[PDB]
Amino acid sequence: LGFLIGYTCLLAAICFFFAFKSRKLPENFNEAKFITFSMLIFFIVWISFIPAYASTYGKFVSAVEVIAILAASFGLLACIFFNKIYIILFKPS
Amino acid sequence: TDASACNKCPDDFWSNENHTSCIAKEIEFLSWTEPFGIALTLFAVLGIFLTAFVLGVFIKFRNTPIVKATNRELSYLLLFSLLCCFSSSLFFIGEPQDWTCRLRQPAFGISFVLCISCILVKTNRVLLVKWWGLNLQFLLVFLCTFMQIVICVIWLYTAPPSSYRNQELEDEIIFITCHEGSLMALGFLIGYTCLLAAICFFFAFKSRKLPENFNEAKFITFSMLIFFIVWISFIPAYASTYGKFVSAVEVIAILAASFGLLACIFFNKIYIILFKPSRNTIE
Numbered sequence: 001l002g003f004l005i006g007y008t009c010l011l012a013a014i015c016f017f018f019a020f021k022s023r024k025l026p027e028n029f030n031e032a033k034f035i036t037f038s039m040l041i042f043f044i045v046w047i048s049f050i051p052a053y054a055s056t057y058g059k060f061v062s063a064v065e066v067i068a069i070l071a072a073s074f075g076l077l078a079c080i081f082f083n084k085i086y087i088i089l090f091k092p093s
Numbered sequence: 094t095d096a097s098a099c100n101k102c103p104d105d106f107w108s109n110e111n112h113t114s115c116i117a118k119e120i121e122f123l124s125w126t127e128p129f130g131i132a133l134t135l136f137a138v139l140g141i142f143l144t145a146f147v148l149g150v151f152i153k154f155r156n157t158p159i160v161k162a163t164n165r166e167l168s169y170l171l172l173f174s175l176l177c178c179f180s181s182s183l184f185f186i187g188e189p190q191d192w193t194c195r196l197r198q199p200a201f202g203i204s205f206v207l208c209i210s211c212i213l214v215k216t217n218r219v220l221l222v223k224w225w226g227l228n229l230q231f232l233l234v235f236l237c238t239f240m241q242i243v244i245c246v247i248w249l250y251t252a253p254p255s256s257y258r259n260q261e262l263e264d265e266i267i268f269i270t271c272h273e274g275s276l277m278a279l280g281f282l283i284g285y286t287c288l289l290a291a292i293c294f295f296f297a298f299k300s301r302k303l304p305e306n307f308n309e310a311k312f313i314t315f316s317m318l319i320f321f322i323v324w325i326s327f328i329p330a331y332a333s334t335y336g337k338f339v340s341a342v343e344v345i346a347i348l349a350a351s352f353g354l355l356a357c358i359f360f361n362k363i364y365i366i367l368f369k370p371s372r373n374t375i376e
């Protein structure tokens with residue numbers, strides 16, 4: 001499980017690097033803000049739950065995982081696709 | 094030898110494994126020399142070191158007019174506030190003595206207000222939206238800070254925090270925590286800080302596209318969003334921990350908020366002042 005977590009964290013860091021390197025692309029092709037904010041949301045949510053995962057081991061040890069998953073993946077969705085959906089529907093160009 | 098009835102062990106004491114003698118319960122609490130504590134205080138001191146290095150950079154290149162466009166004098170106050178905010182994290186990791194519990198939250202609160210209000214006042218387009226010219230921004234930020242100082246002082250005078258020694262969670266382990274007394278004053282403190290941060294976020298949200306000193310108003314927005322993310326994810330992370338790892342989560346949130354405020358907002362200037370694009374600064 002530790003290696004399974006570490007590989008995902010490493011790919012998240014590589015995602016950070018790719019977002020930083022893709023900073024200068026035109027507006028439609030530049031998603032550096034959204035990628036970096038998604039990765040920040042994922043990392044912040046999962047790091048903040050470290051004491052909870054390391055201390056509680058009852059019913060809350062799985063509720064913590066559920067809320068952390070539903071926060072990280074929802075942050076991914078909101079950061080990546082929500083702005084594009086808004087710019088397509090609410091403010092067409 | 095011949096006991097008609099075993100007598101209960103006294104307070105702060107517990108029976109041995111074989112119920113022969115009595116031993117004392119344990120003073121479980123977050124401290125240093127722990128796999129969790131040492132890394133955390135290492136991160137705190139690293140934050141202090143980075144903040145001091147950035148302050149030294151701003152002092153060294155103090156005459157270059159890259160920094161002169163954003164109230165250079167106020168930047169030192171911001172950096173000192175960041176020092177104090179980082180240092181306030183070390184209060185949650187120590188022994189929960191009497192004085193620590195009375196000050197751990199107020200210290201970080203005054204630090205963060207002296208930080209966010211200073212950022213909000215820093216906006217050169219809002220200073221002018223005869224006591225001006227020599228000190229105008231300082232008084233405006235000082236009123237906002239002073240409001241928080243007085244609410245802190247009324248909370249510290251009316252219902253001072255106390256170092257609650259709690260042993261109901263574990264019968265054999267004593268947990269040294271901190272009690273606040275009146276939670277409504279702490280709620281008012283947190284609400285006022287959040288309102289000030291939201292005001293800063295709103296004021297920075299309208300100037301995203303203006304490249305005022307390297308698109309600073311966009312990174313105000315980024316830092317405020319990071320702060321709100323951190324303190325909205327701290328809510329479920331806090332009301333889940335039971336034990337020594339409860340003063341280790343608010344301190345993690347403090348470190349995250351301080352990092353988001355410092356790096357996002359100053360590294361723009363730092364990566365141009367001293368890095369390879371050194372000959373990219375201009376008036």
Ligand SMILES: CC(C)CCC[C@@H](C)[C@H]1CC[C@H]2[C@@H]3CC=C4C[C@@H](O)CC[C@]4(C)[C@H]3CC[C@]12C
Nearest residue numbers: 020023307312356357358359360361362364365
């Ligand atoms: C230092 C690490 C550990 C955390 C801090 C975040 C770093 C990686 C990020 C936050 C915002 C980023 C900056 C965003 C925009 C630009 C403008 C560009 O013209 C030079 C790089 C620069 C200035 C980036 C450098 C990297 C940066 C400072």
Ligand SMILES: C[C@@H](NCCCc1cccc(C(F)(F)F)c1)c1cccc2ccccc12
Nearest residue numbers: 004005006008009046047049050053065069
């Ligand atoms: C859902 C989760 N299962 C164990 C959580 C351990 C954990 C608890 C608290 C904090 C952290 C972390 F921050 F260190 F990641 C991990 C999981 C499963 C599979 C892959 C994952 C990749 C990243 C994160 C979680 C992953």
Ligand SMILES: C[C@@H](NCCCc1cccc(C(F)(F)F)c1)c1cccc2ccccc12
Nearest residue numbers: 198201202276279280282283286287324343
């Ligand atoms: C550090 C953090 N409070 C710590 C205790 C949390 C708590 C513990 C127990 C009860 C409650 C609550 F019920 F009041 F919410 C909260 C804090 C301190 C100061 C200013 C702040 C401003 C913004 C964000 C956080 C701030």
Ligand SMILES: *[C@@H]1O[C@H](CO)[C@@H](O)[C@H](O)[C@H]1NC(C)=O
Nearest residue numbers: 108109110111112113114116
């Ligand atoms: C039982 O209690 C403790 C074990 O934790 C031990 O120190 C003590 O000597 C024991 N008493 C006996 C074996 O009589």
